[model samples]
Target: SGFRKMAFPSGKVEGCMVQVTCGTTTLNGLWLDDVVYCPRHVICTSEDMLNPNYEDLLIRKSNHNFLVQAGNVQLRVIGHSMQNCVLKLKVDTANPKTPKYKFVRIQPGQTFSVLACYNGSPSGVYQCAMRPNFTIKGSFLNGSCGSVGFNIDYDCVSFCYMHHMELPTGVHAGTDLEGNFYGPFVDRQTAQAAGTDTTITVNVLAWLYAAVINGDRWFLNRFTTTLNDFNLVAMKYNYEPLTQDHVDILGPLSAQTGIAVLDMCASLKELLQNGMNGRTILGSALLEDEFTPFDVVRQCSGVT
Candidate 1:
């Protein structure tokens, strides 16, 4: 329940135990199938993933959605045996008519994960692609990989997608969670367990004035200006710039929506930097190419 961005402790699984720490309270759990039957992190075997009724049974709660988790856990089919077998996960398992999926061959342990960090954003954007045509809905969990425990570091954007809240990695100058070098380190991993607000002191000048959302207390990070001792100073050309049309479309710039003072398009990691990649069922993928450029004009174009 905790790992997948769901309201924490909303789920309870296997009675055995594993050593993985979720947050503060180390949980008791067991390993089953290619997955684990654990407490907070809801895991499942390939069989359990395939068994139609297992999703519902495993959820433990009626209000929770089986396909809700986006990037923390995995449902993989290990090639432990050989008979020319090709096991895969149905994109929209609930769709009885036209289901979608893609395959990239396989090794004894290699597999096409249900998730990926496509393009330059986060590793959770495509079913598969170098820059495929995808933002992934049914194939959720496309933010940061669970490497830092499923936290997502999107490219060019300053959104606090997800992070490991189970354990605190205070080493991060100011990480999103897990203490992984999250961009500027001033951002907080918004994926804190539900109904809690253990927010640390956030830098209010870099991007947005300041932030957090929902009962979950999500933070809206910034990449510019001054607030406190951040000394963000001026935006520069060192980062990637917006496209010609990017500058030309609404390019004329807006009086009401202008971001003319700050920098244009730029890379967060390039400004900040590094990798642990992400988590995977087959361990074949990582956040090798997360972080996009700072196209404030275009990003503000989107909103919920």
Candidate 2:
């Protein structure tokens, strides 16, 4: 329900400079006065993202339009083979006296097509929330209320998109949820469960900030260590700076084992060497290179 962002300014080269504790400094000096240099962050934080939690939204089919025939609404939770995953649906609204809306519990393969036939004419921007018994947030789908004030938005961005799949590492310096690194991985992975076709509804930042508690960096340091070198690299460079071309060349390698950052760099060095030897090496793909930079990382001791 969180991880939403407020209205963001676009076209500018810089993004919001935030204060974060990295090592001795309260914030990284290099990015202290900088801005988000990419559109990924900008579009992610834009106002159009006023809907449900992204983790719940991104999985549904792009056929974003749900049918609300007269008094009925239907939603499909595409099921997989995982067991013990329960589905929960709830209705949330602004009217306090209305009593937060709710639906009966449905299992993963059990689809529900509900109809709220109110004799008093039930109406409003109805939001349907779904949750899997095995998941943390239970996927949510908030129908369009069309009010910008009620929209969800987030404040901070995560360090990397890959981390969204990982579990909570620990708390941040001043947060109550899981550590920053832990939040991103969980958010992204859970969002993926929503089915690849879904369009995001809520703000990305709010969900991330909620998921990534600030006070638990101490624990995260330990958690991040367990991840592979490629995941670590993706965490370091996940947010928005990544381009599709780079993703195309390196995305697969990012998931590869033993592919440390230094190994990746080393692969480039090898290519340079090949070029010096009159080899026609041009693109990262042409080399079919893997894990050259990651191989160079001799020591890695951190927790997520």
Candidate 3:
């Protein structure tokens, strides 16, 4: 061996670790001038890594199983070996949460279909996985996963996004001239009929922007409670939670500023009803327009 002929460029005396190939064999993890050699052999091929043994787990996706019906995207799973299986389905790909799953026991070669929807629109990937036994191994068998994807068209003319608007806490809680609780207890039109201040109406509209649009569960919960209370009072007062007159107040403002009331409401309901927190691309884009929270209020209030 030529141990005396150790050569390195510029700083050859300093030791460093490197790999060297000689003839048909390669030497790795070599530290020059401080080398130690140990040899081991692996007797396996590349194909062995891809296929592993799973004696009890056998499952597969049904052939040509992608389907859309009743406003939902669906897929089916077939059992190849075991009769009992547990299936789990999740819809939102970006942010996922647990939902109730189904457990089915069928004869071998039997199939089970899973249907899922988001806000009456067939969209997003529905990932499904199955396990033959729940308690035996704590893991599903190989090739027991499948997904169905939907490419639904957006119908913006019939659909819109919405958000919860917050009322001024100080104003809503304050008493009227009769020293009684006001705000939610009074309908907007009724209050206006009684010659209530235009500023109050503006504040009322400003507070309605409290949607679940930003994934704030606390805000969403509060808004839900507020909506229920508002509607309850409105029902007792023979008024709708949101009416044509209220919508008309925002019509001119939305037309001028591109912030539609229907769009905000639609988006909020769609996301909250489906237990989702992701913002819609279209919603975010339109929401980017610059407009004051009280723009509608001013226009409707006859204020300059």
Candidate 4:
């Protein structure tokens, strides 16, 4: 209603976007006349508040104590609502004894506390501050030792924070698992030590990565000429040629081979590749398929 009466103050709206606030009842557009009006400040040194000595800079935590050795101070910064920002140590200019510490810029909203061992022990009043140029919404708040700031004893000993902090891309999907993606491939390692054949290694790795582990029939087909008579179920059920035929043949094949249909199909592909390509056959020769038995334009239909 008073839109015309109020012109967005002295060139205030020039650089900023109109921000709207959705209250319980109405939506009001806001103009940030002063950049400081919308600054984000996050502060939390460590969640392990119970322990008094947990130093946020120590990567390895022992109980709740983190020691900052002499001639060094562990600086852990847990950033809050700061963006495209930097950290500066606001040393007291008036204090002649205080060391002149320079600030480092960090990405907006990124935690930028470090366990730095600064030189020139001349220590006194120093502050971790953000750039005052234009305080933005995504600006980091009070740095944390863990994310929040915590007082340190500064004894010049090895430091450790209580909380298990997460760095950038630290925690992953499969960090703590065995026999999966990582770990010593004991069997493979032994085989390689004994000069295992390259083909065998490739096949085994393929099996581990795609076939046996992930059940990828295509990969199995490339490497395995004959599946161990127990892995061919999918082929019998799904890829059994749907036509004018009383017997699905796949069921009988499953019974005869005693292998699942999927394995059989993979086995077939491997057999063809090895046989036609003149590679040594790892298993028996190819048996019945829509290709051999029905003589129905073998592999023409791409059934496999």
Model 3 misplaced stretches (Cα beyond 4 Å): 1-174, 181-240, 275-304
lDDT for position 181 in model 2: 22
Across residues 1-304, which tens digit of lDDT does each residue of candidate 4 receive?
Answer: 0000111111111111121111111111111111111101111133432332212322232211211111222322121112211111111122222222221222111111112111212112111211111111121211211111111212211111101122222211100001121111111111212111111111222222222222333333433233322124223322222221212434443443344444444554444334434322222122211112211211112232
Candidate 3 matches the true fold with a TM-score of 0.20
**In candidate 2, where is summed lDDT lowest over 10 consecutive residues?**
144-153
RMSD of each: 18.4, 23.1, 29.3, 25.6
> TM-scores for all candidates?
0.20, 0.15, 0.20, 0.15
Top candidate (lDDT): 3
Q: Residue-wise lDDT of candidate 3 within 1-304, one digit each (tens)?
A: 0001111121111111122221222222112122211111011123422332222211222222211111122222121121111111111121111112211222111111121212222122221111111101111111111111111112111100000111222121111111121223321112222112211221123223421222322212212223444445444433326555555755654555454555544433333345334533223421211112333233234342
RMSD of 4: 25.6
Per-residue lDDT tens digits for candidate 2, residues 109-216, read 111111111111212222121111221221112211111101111332222100011123221101011122211222221222222111111111111112222221
Model 3 CA lDDT for position 234: 40
Compose the digit string of candidate 1's lDDT tens values, residues 1-304. Answer: 0111111110111111123222222222122223322222223332442333433433443221222222243223222111111011222222122112111222111101222222112333221111111111123232222211111122111112122112232221111221222232222233222211211111111121100111111121244422211223112212223233323432223233344323222122223332223422112132212111122222333321
Q: How many backbone clashes does candidate 2 have?
A: 65
